[PDB]
Design a protein around this ligand. Structure first.
Ligand SMILES: [Zn+2]
Length: 672
């Protein structure tokens, strides 16, 4: 039941056409393939004509039960024109004049009483017709005959548009006609087409579909097709402004929904961005208004250097937590990195803007508004200082808003304080180096806590619960990556945590390398780690130790204690009490105004005893400082529970005394 061209070419036309009528197109071997047999088959102007005629007779007789092989009769012809496009010698099939020979057959299908939606056959006939037009020709007479089908589809819009078959049929029918028409007037004058100004009944049928109004989630696409192709076919309308008016009506009708954005795109691209009144439509303003609709609320923190623009449905509690969460990750990150001063002067990240949508659905419009992928839980655009996300439920996503935010916040920090230059575009990216690092350390810093350094996050330990066999990445494999499975980031984290807990010296040396822009240093470290097999066993067991921690693991989240009304504490007191408790010298402070509270940032020097070595110093400094935060929180002022602290710029005095710049940040309830 599988046929070759070298068999079909020997058959009579009468025999051939009859055969095609009762076989499927895929039964022909190499139909769309260019062969010596294919060239010979379609090279016969009479044979193709016989096929065209056989189609015409099939279209004149077909019923609801039998298709009379119209699908097969259309695909062979499609193969003909397709091969006539890409190969010389069949270039007569490329000429539209010959393609017009299909129109008499097309008309026959349309004049059949069975030319409507109904049974699977009837639907596939419209589909097959539509696909043919795209490769062949349409004139205007055939276009206008599609009206009763569009009317039929439109009249039962709420029943047919959710189905794939009928829906696909109408879409293919329109899409195909548009394809033929545009390609015909590619650079030619539009005013000189055989159909120009004659397809008004068809155009009007698209207005009706496009401007349907009463749409659901199931039928939105249908009116979308209506509007999109109202614009496209409207180019062949004797009235420009009439169409534009309908497109303007589409905007007003479905305001700040998919079809609004489509209609506005249609005005700017198809109609020079000129209104029906004849004045330039301000597309920017539309997007500006659309964003204000979805992000109506603003919350300003840190003297305006931390702005959350958010949907009307996102809780004010979350807004506050997200501020406080930023402050934890910040502190932990700064401890490990040892720099809090920004690398570049006058950047975007001087203001961190976060745009949070009400939900994933509403989130999608961001890509219309700000032109950034929205196929994600959230995204940090560095050149903009901007983090786009949406509030989510526990069902919509397994990460929550804060869990996600803590993760992405780290990317802002990495770009601002760690990687000199444009993030992803420096010497460190000339080769694949930081793939595990950037994504890995961020999964990791998301685990930040107020008084307990950085902890692992349950859910991630949850992933590592899988097959120990192979699968579990080696230290060599993790550091060096084009393709790698989703688990790559989970083992990337396993490294960052391994280094943190089991080997700080390395982890610190690594960050200093990035910080100082020393690729040579960084590579030497990655080489040492990958070449040493003992460091892999250290790592392999640590992954097991993380898998061991999962059962009783938590998710680091900002505490309810942050949101409490702490009450007035005098400013001068807080500073003194902190300065003494942390043995700080030469202190200065800045107060910053926020939306719901004020905050202070205390900057001091701490000089300790004699040095125990950089990395032992860091460990002790951490323990001493986390100790100072916990002791201050034993005080009666609830405010000390909002405190976060870090230390940077490690050095040693002429007399070998430990030295750090130390920073405290917390709530300020004193106004004066
Ligand atoms: Zn990330």
């Amino acid at each position: 039941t599988m046929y070759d061209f070298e068999y079909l070419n020997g058959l009579s036309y009468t025999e051939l056409t009859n055969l095609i009528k009762n076989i499927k197109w895929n039964q022909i071997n190499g139909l769309f393939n260019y062969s010596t047999g294919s060239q010979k088959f379609f090279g016969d102007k009479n044979r193709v004509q016989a096929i065209i005629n056989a189609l015409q007779e099939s279209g004149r007789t077909y019923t609801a039960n039998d298709m009379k092989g119209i699908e097969t009769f259309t695909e062979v012809l499609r193969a003909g024109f397709y091969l006539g496009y890409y190969n010389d010698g069949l270039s007569y099939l490329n000429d539209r004049n010959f393609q017009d020979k299909c129109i008499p057959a097309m008309i026959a299908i349309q004049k059949n009483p069975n030319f409507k939606l109904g049974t699977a056959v009837q639907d596939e006939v419209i589909t097959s017709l539509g696909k043919l037009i795209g490769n062949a020709s349409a004139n205007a007479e055939v276009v206008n005959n599609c009206v009763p089908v569009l009317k039929q589809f439109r009249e039962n819009l709420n029943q047919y548009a959710p189905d794939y078959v009928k829906g696909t049929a109408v879409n293919e029918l329109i899409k195909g006609i548009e394809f033929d028409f545009s390609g015909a007037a590619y650079e030619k004058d539009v005013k000189t087409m055989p159909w120009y100004g004659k397809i008004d009944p068809f155009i009007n049928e698209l207005k009706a579909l496009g401007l349907y109004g009463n749409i659901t989630s199931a039928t939105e696409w249908a009116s979308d097709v209506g509007i999109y192709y109202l614009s496209k076919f409207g180019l062949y309308s004797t009235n420009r402004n009439d169409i534009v008016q309908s497109l303007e009506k589409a905007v007003d009708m479905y305001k700040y929904g998919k079809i609004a954005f489509v209609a506005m795109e249609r005005i700017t691209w198809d109609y020079d961005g000129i209104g029906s009144n004849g004045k330039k439509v301000d597309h920017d303003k539309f997007l500006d208004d659309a964003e204000k609709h979805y992000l109506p609320k603003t919350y300003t923190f840190d003297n305006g250097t931390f702005i959350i623009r958010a949907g009307d449905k996102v809780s004010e509690e979350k807004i506050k937590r997200l501020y406080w969460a930023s402050r934890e990750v910040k502190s932990q990150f700064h401890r490990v990195v040892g720099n809090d001063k920004a690398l570049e002067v006058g950047n975007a990240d001087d203001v961190l803007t976060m745009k949070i949508f009400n939900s994933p659905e509403e989130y999608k419009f961001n890509t219309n508004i700000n032109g950034v992928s929205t196929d994600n839980g959230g995204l940090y655009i560095e050149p903009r200082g901007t983090f786009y996300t949406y509030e989510r439920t526990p069902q919509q996503s397994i990460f929550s808003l804060e869990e996600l935010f803590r993760h992405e916040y780290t990317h802002y920090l990495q770009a601002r304080y760690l990687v000199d230059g444009l993030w992803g575009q420096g010497p460190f990216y000339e080769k694949n180096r930081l793939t595990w690092f950037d994504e890995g350390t961020a999964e990791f810093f998301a685990g930040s806590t107020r008084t307990s350094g950085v902890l692992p996050r349950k859910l991630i330990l949850g992933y590592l619960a899988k097959d120990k066999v192979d699968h579990r990445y080696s230290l060599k494999k993790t550091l060096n990556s084009d393709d790698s499975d989703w688990m790559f980031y989970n083992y990337g984290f396993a490294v960052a945590h391994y280094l943190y807990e089991k080997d700080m010296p390395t982890f610190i040396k690594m960050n200093k390398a990035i910080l100082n822009t020393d690729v040579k240093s960084y590579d030497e470290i990655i080489k040492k780690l990958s070449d040493d097999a003992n460091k892999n066993t250290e790592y392999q067991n640590h992954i097991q130790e993380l898998v061991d921690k999962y059962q009783g693991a938590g998710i680091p989240l900002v505490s309810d204690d942050y949101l409490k009304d702490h009450g007035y504490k005098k400013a001068s007191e807080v500073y003194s009490e902190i300065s003494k408790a942390a043995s700080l010298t030469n202190t200065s402070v800045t107060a910053e105004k926020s939306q719901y509270f004020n905050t202070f940032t205390l900057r001091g020097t701490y000089t300790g005893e004699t040095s125990k070595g950089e990395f032992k110093d860091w460990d002790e400094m951490s323990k001493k400082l986390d100790g100072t935060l916990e002791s201050l929180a034993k005080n009666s002022w609830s405010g000390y529970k909002t405190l976060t602290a870090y230390f940077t710029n490690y050095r040693v005095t002429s007399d070998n005394k430990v030295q750090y710049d130390v920073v405290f940040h917390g709530v300020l309830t004193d106004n004066g």
